[PDB]
Amino acid sequence: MREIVHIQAGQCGNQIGAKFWEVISDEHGIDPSGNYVGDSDLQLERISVYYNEASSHKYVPRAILVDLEPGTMDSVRSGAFGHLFRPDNFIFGQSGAGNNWAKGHYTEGAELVDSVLDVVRKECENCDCLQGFQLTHSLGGGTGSGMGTLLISKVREEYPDRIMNTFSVVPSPKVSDTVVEPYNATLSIHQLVENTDETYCIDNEALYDICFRTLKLATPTYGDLNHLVSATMSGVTTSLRFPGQLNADLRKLAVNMVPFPRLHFFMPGFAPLTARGSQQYRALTVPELTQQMFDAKNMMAACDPRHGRYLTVATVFRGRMSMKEVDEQMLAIQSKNSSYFVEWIPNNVKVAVCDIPPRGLKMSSTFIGNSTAIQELFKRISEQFTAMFRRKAFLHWYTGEGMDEMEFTEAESNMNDLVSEYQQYQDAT
Amino acid sequence: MREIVHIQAGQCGNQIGAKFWEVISDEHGIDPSGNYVGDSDLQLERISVYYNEASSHKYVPRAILVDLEPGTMDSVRSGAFGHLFRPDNFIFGQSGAGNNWAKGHYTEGAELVDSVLDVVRKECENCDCLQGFQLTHSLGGGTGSGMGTLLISKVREEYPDRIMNTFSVVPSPKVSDTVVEPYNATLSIHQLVENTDETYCIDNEALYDICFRTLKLATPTYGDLNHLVSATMSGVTTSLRFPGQLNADLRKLAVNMVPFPRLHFFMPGFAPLTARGSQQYRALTVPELTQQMFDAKNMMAACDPRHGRYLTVATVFRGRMSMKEVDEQMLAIQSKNSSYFVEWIPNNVKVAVCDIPPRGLKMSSTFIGNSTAIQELFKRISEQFTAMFRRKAFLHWYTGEGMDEMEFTEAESNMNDLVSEYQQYQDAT
Amino acid sequence: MRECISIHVGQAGVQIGNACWELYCLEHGIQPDGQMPHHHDSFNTFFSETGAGKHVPRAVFVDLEPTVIDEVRTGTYRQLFHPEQLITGKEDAANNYARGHYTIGKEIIDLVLDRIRKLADQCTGLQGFLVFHSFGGGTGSGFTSLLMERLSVDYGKKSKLEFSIYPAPQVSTAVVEPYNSILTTHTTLEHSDCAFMVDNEAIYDICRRNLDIERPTYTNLNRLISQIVSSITASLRFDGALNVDLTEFQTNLVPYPRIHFPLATYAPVISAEKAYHEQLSVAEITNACFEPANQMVKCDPRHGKYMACCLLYRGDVVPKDVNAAIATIKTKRSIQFVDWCPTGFKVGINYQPPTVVPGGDLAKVQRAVCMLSNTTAIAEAWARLDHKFDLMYAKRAFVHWYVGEGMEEGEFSEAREDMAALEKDYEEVGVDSVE
Amino acid sequence: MRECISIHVGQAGVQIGNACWELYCLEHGIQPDGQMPHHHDSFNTFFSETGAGKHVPRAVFVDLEPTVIDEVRTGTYRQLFHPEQLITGKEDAANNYARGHYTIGKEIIDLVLDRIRKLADQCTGLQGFLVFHSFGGGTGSGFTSLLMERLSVDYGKKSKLEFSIYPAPQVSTAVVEPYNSILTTHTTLEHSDCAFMVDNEAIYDICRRNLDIERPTYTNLNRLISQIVSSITASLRFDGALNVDLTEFQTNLVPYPRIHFPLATYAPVISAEKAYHEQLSVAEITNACFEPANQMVKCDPRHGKYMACCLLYRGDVVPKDVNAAIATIKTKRSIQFVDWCPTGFKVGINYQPPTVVPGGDLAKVQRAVCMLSNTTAIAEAWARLDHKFDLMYAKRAFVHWYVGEGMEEGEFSEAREDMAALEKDYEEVGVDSVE
Ligand SMILES: Nc1nc2c(ncn2[C@@H]2O[C@H](COP(=O)(O)OP(=O)(O)OP(=O)(O)O)[C@@H](O)[C@H]2O)c(=O)[nH]1
Ligand SMILES: Nc1nc2c(ncn2[C@@H]2O[C@H](COP(=O)(O)OP(=O)(O)OP(=O)(O)O)[C@@H](O)[C@H]2O)c(=O)[nH]1
Ligand SMILES: Nc1nc2c(ncn2[C@@H]2O[C@H](COP(=O)(O)OP(=O)(O)O)[C@@H](O)[C@H]2O)c(=O)[nH]1
Ligand SMILES: Nc1nc2c(ncn2[C@@H]2O[C@H](COP(=O)(O)OP(=O)(O)O)[C@@H](O)[C@H]2O)c(=O)[nH]1
Ligand SMILES: [Mg+2]
Ligand SMILES: [Mg+2]
């Protein structure tokens, strides 16, 4: 019950999804062929939430892989853990978004969004009681941004009651992997703050920093970053895919973390993060995890929390632990950082506890902080957008697909309004 | 008991019949020599309905193969599964219809129709209790159209009580395999709406589309299309050739599907249709079949049902299943598509269930929809006919065989009246 | 049991027949002496069989000059033909229609008809006639007109197909081509079920451009036309997934009694060295067939409208691809059929691939397609001939030969009126309908 | 299923193509005859495949002088190309734009377009065009202008990439280079999506200093430009951790409709003996790419500002190092982008290392990086050409050839106005914004 549908847009979304399904299959003991070879019945007691039991006793992920260029699709298809996706799912086009948002939302996307929605509808009717949607996409790449926003708008039209999750890879502050990414970011954020329940902001910069310093890895390949994001997502969903002394569901997180309709952008975090050698020289206790999760050097979003306040915080543990210990740790961490939390939300730590470790550990933890610091991020992007709009640079590519300036004017105004709201609530009293 | 006589007119009819008898023999476990080597007595408990037990314990199909050119006849004769037809059946002429209807119904057909009727009469007297006739023919080719209409008229003269089935391959909308096919179609339809109980319209376009998209075949040879039509026919007859929890006969379908004497044109459909690879990644449940059977992309007639309403619908399942499941599925599908059914026919889904799968599978299903959408088809053809009659193009070939213009005038008026009736009942209230 | 005889009139017909029967004997594994060391019967439709393993063709080679027939009797194909059929006259018409239709041919027409009747009565499922005859030569025009009238008198309703050699617009070997053409057309217009326009100039062009041979002999043009004929008859002579008989041809490609002049086209035509470097898609070869540079009559199809088309494929062909290709062809605008014929195709598929004649020029292909297309562009061609006629009649040039050989000027005037009427009919059909 | 055809105009284009297709055939393990004894499909994007194991390139080699094309037909790469594509004229433009755009090329432009259309329709996911053409030669300038106008008319919205050979400031083999350059630029300014500036002088400099070869032939410059092209297309032709398609190129590197002249650069370029003695850090090779002595256009980047950059890496590359190196590059002051573009990079990573051509000059490396950079320094270069033009127009030198070959003086004046406008636009963009 409470089945979840997985959508993967853009190249980053698809790669993250490949690693994500690898992780999930490892969790439930699923062979690459798609048949169960596990050992613990609890794996199958909720196997339906992400998988569908196809006949002859096989399992197929409830995935809907979307793209506009067959390259990465075929890469996924050929590689291992690709032979179990249901082959009818791989929707792809030929033109390619060309790293443009106008193509990804108006011209090219309008031709595949119908087929995507049809497969979505088939999967929805297949499920018993739909729980919600999780969309894995970028914010820079044209396909990800444009087509994901279009799909979100259409789905919200057809399912205004379900819950919506997005794992959007926000552009990094220092580097810029693309050139027009401010435009894509602004338009995508406009659509998201329109029609999304929660948005898990991530930067590649923070993941680089974590893989470098904390994990002591000088050679971070994209496999590792995607592995980290996959572990975060698995930690988010294990609260319902598994039994727990204090269980959680996606709707619980949405209610707890989203005080106002618009302010629903979360920065995630994971713990423990130990190098290969520096592991046996540290104790794995709940206080250690809790103290690890609260610092700028372990936030997957490149913005110091100290510059603002945590509006709310959710914390999902795993593995066998003692509830009193967790409560004591949360009390201490809420006490000593009193200036780091908003005054008018007393007891602002949502807690959930699972019963199964994320495989290969004693106990883990996932942090989901809805703070005001992220305003800086938007601030940054907004400014960049403004600059690249003041000269109307690159404007012709977007204008040529039917979009016009007033779109950009409205989107920038909307983002500035959002930043104003974040600022207002940060200094509320 | 309830023996059925098979007639095959025109080249398409004969090829379809060859594949059809291959399928039936595979069903009953009949060797190519015509002797039974099966393993289940239920095969022989009703083997008489289509076969005759010839002496020395052999079986001969109750087939009557008709043509005007010995080419395809000899092709059938030489090929395997041809050595069991009774050789006296192969009636053929020498002139050939020349893709003309006037030849196929007035000049050339008048010389062989007598021998055909004589063999028909012999087979009828041979049977214990005749059930009905099934005619497999085209609508474009001259032999099929003309001679089949002539045979139907004569048989209806000599057996006004039996039931009449036709599998007429309607011309496709986009392509046109012949040049004068509007004339043949109009005249044949005139005769059919005169003297037929039911007519199973089929287009090659829809079969191409199914073999391309659904089956994922880029090389559809005519063998495959004929195989599909044969599977449909076998599914239609298995309701009486085999035991079933809720059995059906041809007369049952005729009564249920034909509310008015003229409006008896059905579009068929088959399910499941799975590619070679995409099979194990899908569950074979009654809901899956039912949802597959209702969509334009699986109707063997090239016309979207959504453009009109289903006047009536019949559904014949196979293999072991649960009746309650079927009832629930039909209820749901009648509920959600309320605008897709006619108001004044409550509970418009006839259901039948057999007990044997069509070999290799767990459960199959055959759909027989009598809708109003097919009017478009006739509309199309009518218009084409009108155009080719406005200039009187190709008129001399048909005039030279005794037929005159007033024939065409009356036939076109009759077809327009039929379309008017379909339109009237589509928007009835 | 569907027999079809071949009648070759004039030197052009006889040489084309040499090529055609070489091709057939190669197809069915038939030695030149009639012996033979997917097939069915197949050869029965064109080859009759005697007691021994010796088969003979159903051909009637008639000529008024014994030169070419003597070459046939002396060629490697000496043992093949039934020696009674090789009818030879004494003095050829010498490019004079009157001689070929009133004076000389009148004295062997009876023997030719007698041999025709013998061959017909020895058959059972006779389909129709294949007349291989030119248009400029005197024997061709005159004798063919006479023979067609006689056969139409005798065999009331049977297929009668001609393979005329339409006189080229600019290359003319004869000098009186307009006279012979106009007379033979005025005669055959009421008897021939379906002609088949082919020209030498277009075949020269095709041989130079596509096959990359700059110096072709008549052997090459003859081989190409033989390939076209073989593709026409492959339906009768072989097992195909969608067969078609000659009556279907005359029914499909002839909208009106008079307008029955479809032009031929064949594809693919590529040299052995260029055989690779292209996979030869069936859609590709369809496009090649519709390419205005590949037609075998010097007329741009874009100046007219395809009233009907008939594409006969052979080899490893799959119907879905044919349907897709024809749909695409119908989509394009430069190929514009008449409004009143919305269905402008007959399709036929055969299982036997074309066979390449050793010592030939083409390359072994797996798929082939012959298009027989009845269009309106050909009408303009008549105008040209008409024009020529007018000039050569304005001075009464060359008239004395025809006058003194059993014909009158009023006949010339009447034939001119008839050609004008045909051109008028083509123009009238070319227009669109109202309402 | 993302196809991209190549069009080589003029002798420069044809020789560069010789090098490029040698490189490709080496990359995918393709024998010269199209046979083949991390890879996927890969080669499908540039190689079409026939029934046998023979693949053919999607190239259209067009020229007006048959010499170089004949060399191609006689070279070791004879069996490869589809012989129909090797279009040859009769009399070359002889370094005259008017001949190459009005008189001569006007008579084979139709055949070229026909072959283009055939190749396009045989493809399904056509990405765009690669025009390999010089700038000084008459055929290059004129024929390329004509062909670009025709394609832009035909294919409305598709990628069109050129690899021009910018005329050097001091080494000029031609004498009328300013005229051809100005005319072809005025024409192509409205049709080419993204050009690619490369010069021979800079490549001479690079070959002498870095590769330590003092006497290079055109073979070496061609090999270098082929390596650049291969690095551009490695994203389409291979599996990479961050791929990029040509539409992404035109979106990223083209801020305004007119300013679309990015210059190329490649690294590392080190001789085999100097292959050791350096570990070739990705940060090191990035610095090499930004070194003003390594650019392949004789323009000091320090005199302008990088409006955009696109770095395509290949081989054993790790994204964190790329991020660090680019951060460092952004830190330094001598590399000063425009204020209004704060994000001046597109990054692409491929998994396939560059492959060294046997008999070549470079050394087997594990990492490589091609930079396509759109800057403002190139503007000054236009000034130089403008200056030259002015002088050669102040005396009306050489004007009579162009006048008598289908062109007017008002056209020269208009092209001068257009070049002045482009220089004005470059200067206007180079300034900073207020408020
Ligand atoms: N295609 C083709 N045409 C030929 C060939 N040989 C002759 N012709 C045609 O024959 C025409 C000459 O007139 P013919 O019909 O041959 O005259 P004939 O057959 O000798 O009979 P007479 O007119 O009485 O001499 C020329 O226009 C040629 O086009 C050939 O080998 N192939
Ligand atoms: N990089 C490079 N450039 C070349 C090569 N060969 C010729 N060129 C360039 O070609 C220019 C000469 O004009 P071309 O474009 O070759 O003239 P063309 O291609 O022969 O055509 P026409 O002008 O009609 O003769 C010179 O400026 C060279 O820079 C080569 O092998 N490599
Ligand atoms: N975390 C992560 N991000 C990626 C990965 N690959 C690409 N990205 C990000 O995705 C963005 C590119 O979007 P992409 O999907 O490739 O372009 P699109 O085809 O237009 O959607 C860049 O900003 C990258 O930062 C990956 O493996 N991991
Ligand atoms: N479904 C199907 N239709 C066919 C096949 N062969 C021919 N047809 C159809 O039959 C028609 C030709 O009729 P045909 O019997 O060959 O001509 P006839 O001899 O005058 O009756 C065409 O419109 C084809 O669409 C086949 O194998 N399968
Ligand atoms: Mg003669
Ligand atoms: Mg040149």
Author numbering:
A (entry chain D), B (entry chain B): 1 to 429
C (entry chain A), D (entry chain C): 1 to 37, 40 to 42, 47 to 441
Q: Which text from the study accompanies this structure?
A:
pmcMicrotubules (MTs) for m by self-assembly of GTP-bound αβ-tubulin heterodimers into a cylinder consisting of laterally associated linear protofilaments (pfs). During incorporation into the MT lattice, GTP hydrolysis is triggered by the catalytic glutamate in α-tubulin (E254), which becomes juxtaposed to the GTP in β-tubulin at the longitudinal interface between dimers.
We first determined the cryo-EM structure of MTs polymerized from recombinant wt human tubulin to 3.8-Å resolution. Lattice parameters of these MTs, both undecorated and decorated with kinesin-1 motor domains, were nearly indistinguishable from previously reported GDP-MT structures assembled from mammalian brain tubulin. On the other hand, the outward rotation of the seam-proximal pfs in GDP-MTs, both for the wt MTs described here and the previously described porcine MTs, may reflect tension buildup at the seam resulting from GTP hydrolysis.
